[PDB]
Amino acid sequence: QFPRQCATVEALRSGMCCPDLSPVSGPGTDRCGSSSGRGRCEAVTADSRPHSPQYPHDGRDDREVWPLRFFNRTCHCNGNFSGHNCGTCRPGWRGAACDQRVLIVRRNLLDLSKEEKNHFVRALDMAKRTTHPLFVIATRRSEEILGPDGNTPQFENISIYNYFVWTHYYSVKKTFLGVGQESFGEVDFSHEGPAFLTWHRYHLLRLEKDMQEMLQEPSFSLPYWNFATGKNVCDICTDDLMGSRSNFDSTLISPNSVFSQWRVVCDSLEDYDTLGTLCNSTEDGPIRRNPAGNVARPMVQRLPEPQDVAQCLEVGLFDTPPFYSNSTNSFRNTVEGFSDPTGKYDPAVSSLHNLAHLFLNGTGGQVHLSPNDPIFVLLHTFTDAVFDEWLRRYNADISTFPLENAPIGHNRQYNMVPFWPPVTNTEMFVTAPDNLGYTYEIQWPS
Ligand SMILES: *[C@@H]1O[C@H](CO[C@@H]2O[C@@H](C)[C@@H](O)[C@@H](O)[C@@H]2O)[C@@H](O[C@@H]2O[C@H](CO)[C@@H](O)[C@H](O)[C@H]2NC(C)=O)[C@H](O)[C@H]1NC(C)=O
Ligand SMILES: *[C@@H]1O[C@H](CO)[C@@H](O[C@@H]2O[C@H](CO)[C@@H](O)[C@H](O)[C@H]2NC(C)=O)[C@H](O)[C@H]1NC(C)=O
Ligand SMILES: *[C@@H]1O[C@H](CO)[C@@H](O[C@@H]2O[C@H](CO)[C@@H](O)[C@H](O)[C@H]2NC(C)=O)[C@H](O)[C@H]1NC(C)=O
Ligand SMILES: *[C@@H]1O[C@H](CO[C@@H]2O[C@@H](C)[C@@H](O)[C@@H](O)[C@@H]2O)[C@@H](O)[C@H](O)[C@H]1NC(C)=O
Ligand SMILES: *[C@@H]1O[C@H](CO)[C@@H](O)[C@H](O)[C@H]1NC(C)=O
Ligand SMILES: O=c1cccccc1O
Ligand SMILES: [Zn+2]
Ligand SMILES: [Zn+2]
């Protein structure tokens, strides 16, 4: 979402989000760090290719051709500089000159020491309470963004972790068609299409970087949850990490975990989808979680089996037409979980990633809310590790990631919505250890 210095009347009217780095001559003298060599203000490239017919409302949604409905000029950085004003470094690099390499290791959360587990939990809890230094979130769509009087930007501050929740919400929210009309919901800029894995990859990368800055620990890394154990229970739902079940309400988190104190954002779909507003930073109810608790649905009462992961990693094509939740023999659709682990589509089956969400039978298994449950982080780093292992095994073959006719938001050159600065699926479709500054300490079934 947008840098706080671009969430202004002036930037929104100029169409330019090219903030100063730190200037030596007045405002606007160091846009994008052009006074050093770090970058320059340029016209943004957004994907212009056609999408699948499933979305019939071109012209109606701010997420189309992201970010062109808000800005048409942004910072393009030189070399291995990066960031909204080119003031930081590309993934894998540090130093004032972005020339020292860093490789952090994402580890199984259960393999961490006692103090590392406690450090992780406290860091998450700190991220939930600490204001994001850079980004603010819109509470209104683009026509109402400058407020009732036209001079009051409708943006709020938000914590580092709630920004993580909000961006996921925004990628899945329904298209608002107007007061009195039913919002359109067969749209999803981050699920049910090729962009699913690269979207969630950047999602994690952005949270990890914000927490590194927040902790001033450049090597801080996010652990993972191997949910592919076939278990009846959530083996990370203990009070020293992520929280066990409350003995006073089977759907709440134990009061002996800090996560029982968390309150969720974005739980007012009734307001957003009838008034045309957006999720704001005001929190509401507690996390609901009831692992294996969905008695109405026995197939989401057990986590995936270890051979489900080994089978989905045999699927050698990243995606297949129609690049949607009913693709067959699609690695993306298999690990997302709409196919069985062999690649066969079946509308009645939930597996791998989808199954892990639904297993939680609560906040973590509702699409507009699921990052509110911090198990989301660990669930998706494991999903990302499977993706990365696939990238290594099939030499990151992006040829099947479609350029056209994917569901809207899922064309290969689409800037993943609503991430800032603009970043395409292509930029995430690379093996992580040599291109993004992280790797997984993990072993695969075999
Ligand atoms: C780049 O953007 C400027 C500013 O317009 C804003 O850009 C978008 C975010 C969109 O939401 C517009 O409504 C914003 O006003 C463009 O210049 C404006 O062009 C419009 C025509 O649509 C005109 O009515 C305004 O008077 C213009 N304002 C200014 C300050 O020039 C500009 O055309 C865009 N350049 C492109 C697209 O190449
Ligand atoms: C932030 O979001 C909440 C939830 O949509 C808004 O609160 C609701 O406002 C409507 C209409 O004003 C009420 O009918 C609901 O009862 C409210 N819900 C709750 C839980 O209070 C709130 O107004 C939003 N804030 C801003 C600044 O837009
Ligand atoms: C968690 O699982 C329970 C089932 O164990 C869900 O509650 C059921 O919801 C279905 C669908 O609406 C109803 O037909 C049943 O009558 C409900 N049963 C009970 C006991 O409430 C619940 O919706 C699930 N929650 C989430 C977030 O997935
Ligand atoms: C948002 O909050 C602003 C505060 O800005 C700064 O944000 C972080 C880094 C904290 O350290 C905080 O203490 C800082 O002062 C306020 O100035 C303002 O009320 C808010 N702005 C908007 C646009 O909502
Ligand atoms: C997949 O879903 C789309 C959208 O409804 C449909 O048009 C298409 O025929 C489906 N493909 C199948 C079932 O193979
Ligand atoms: O990807 C999801 C799948 C199923 C349920 C809830 C939330 C999700 O983000
Ligand atoms: Zn998701
Ligand atoms: Zn998910």
Residue pair 372/266 in contact (Cβ under 8 Å)? The answer is: yes
Euclidean distance between CA atoms 198 and 417, whole angstroms: 11
Region for residue 420 given its phi and psi (left: phi exceeds 0; alpha: psi -120 to 50; beta: otherwise) = beta
Residue pair 136/70 in contact (Cβ under 8 Å)? The answer is: no
Residue to probe by mutation, ligand 1, list 9, 12, 13, most atoms within 8 Å of CB: 13
Give the method of determination. X-ray
Region for residue 286 given its phi and psi (left: phi exceeds 0; alpha: psi -120 to 50; beta: otherwise) = beta
Helix extents (H) in 313-370:
331-336, 352-359
Euclidean distance between CA atoms 206 and 212, whole angstroms: 10
What 171-177 contacts at long range (C-beta under 8 Å, 24+ apart), as own/partner pairs, is 171/63, 171/199, 171/409, 171/417, 171/418, 172/367, 172/368, 173/272, 173/278, 173/279, 173/368, 174/273, 175/55, 175/57, 175/60, 175/61, 176/61, 176/141, 176/272, 176/273, 176/276, 177/57, 177/60
Q: What is the token pair recorded at 403?
A: 């350029």
Q: What is the token pair recorded at 420?
A: 């800032």
Classify strands 135-138 and 2-3 as parallel, antiparallel or unpaired: antiparallel
Q: Atom 8 of ligand 2 has which residue's CA nearest to it?
A: 271
Please indicate whether residue 280, judged by its CB atom, sits closer than 6 Å to ligand 2. Answer: yes
User: What is the number of the ligand 3 atom nearest to the C-alpha of 362?
Assistant: 27
Q: Atom 14 of ligand 5 has which residue's CA nearest to it?
A: 326
Region for residue 387 given its phi and psi (left: phi exceeds 0; alpha: psi -120 to 50; beta: otherwise) = alpha
Please indicate whether residue 55, judged by its CB atom, sits closer than 6 Å to ligand 5. Answer: no
How far does residue 282's CA lie from ligand 3's centre (Å)? 27
Q: Residue 310: which H helix or E strand, with range?
A: helix 306-312
Q: Atom 35 of ligand 1 has which residue's CA nearest to it?
A: 72
Please indicate whether residue 370, judged by its CB atom, sits closer than 6 Å to ligand 6. Answer: yes
Close Cβ partners of 129 (under 8 Å, ≥ 6 residues apart): 159
DSSP character string of 78-102: -TTEESTTS-EE-TTEETTTT-EE-
Quoted resolution (Å): 2.3
Euclidean distance between CA atoms 237 and 292, whole angstroms: 12
Of 213, 64, 45, which Cα lies nearest the Cα of 127?
A: 213
Q: Atom 3 of ligand 6 has which residue's CA nearest to it?
A: 354
Euclidean distance between CA atoms 307 and 294, whole angstroms: 23
User: What is the number of the ligand 1 atom nearest to the C-alpha of 14?
Assistant: 4
Please indicate whether residue 271, judged by its CB atom, sits closer than 6 Å to ligand 2. Answer: yes
Helix extents (H) in 6-102:
9-14
How far does residue 67's CA lie from ligand 8's centre (Å)? 23
Report the residue count for the chain. Answer: 446
Residue pair 258/144 in contact (Cβ under 8 Å)? The answer is: no
User: What is the number of the ligand 6 atom nearest to the C-alpha of 367?
Assistant: 7
Distances in whole angstroms, Cα of residue 258 to Cα of each of 32, 128, 262, 381, 432 = 40, 11, 7, 21, 32
What 92-98 contacts at long range (C-beta under 8 Å, 24+ apart), as own/partner pairs, is 92/434, 92/435, 92/436, 92/437, 92/438, 93/437, 94/218
Block residue for tokens 């608002």: 176
Residue pair 213/135 in contact (Cβ under 8 Å)? The answer is: no
Residue pair 4/421 in contact (Cβ under 8 Å)? The answer is: no
Count helices and strands (H / E) in the chain: 11, 12
Residue pair 425/195 in contact (Cβ under 8 Å)? The answer is: yes
* Nearest ligand for residue 66 CA: 1
Task: Give the HSE-up count for residue 39: Cα atoms under 13 Å, Cβ half-sphere.
Answer: 30
Of 409, 424, 422, 440, which Cα lies nearest the Cα of 2?
A: 422
Cα angle value 234/235/237 (rounded, 5°): 70
User: What is the number of the ligand 4 atom nearest to the C-alpha of 157?
Assistant: 1
Euclidean distance between CA atoms 385 and 436, whole angstroms: 13
Close Cβ partners of 76 (under 8 Å, ≥ 6 residues apart): 32, 39, 40, 41, 42
How far does residue 342's CA lie from ligand 3's centre (Å)? 29
- Which amino acid, one-letter code, is at 402? P
Phi, psi of 169 (to 5 degrees): -55, -50
Euclidean distance between CA atoms 228 and 343, whole angstroms: 17
Q: Residue 233: which H helix or E strand, with range?
A: none
- Torsion on CA atoms 378, 379, 381, 383, rounded to nearest 10: 170
Q: Atom 1 of ligand 5 has which residue's CA nearest to it?
A: 326
Of 376, 125, 417, which Cα lies nearest the Cα of 259?
A: 125
Q: What is the token pair recorded at 437?
A: 């500054």
Q: Atom 8 of ligand 4 has which residue's CA nearest to it?
A: 133
Q: Atom 10 of ligand 1 has which residue's CA nearest to it?
A: 69
Residue pair 273/174 in contact (Cβ under 8 Å)? The answer is: yes
Beta bridge partner(s), residue 107: 441
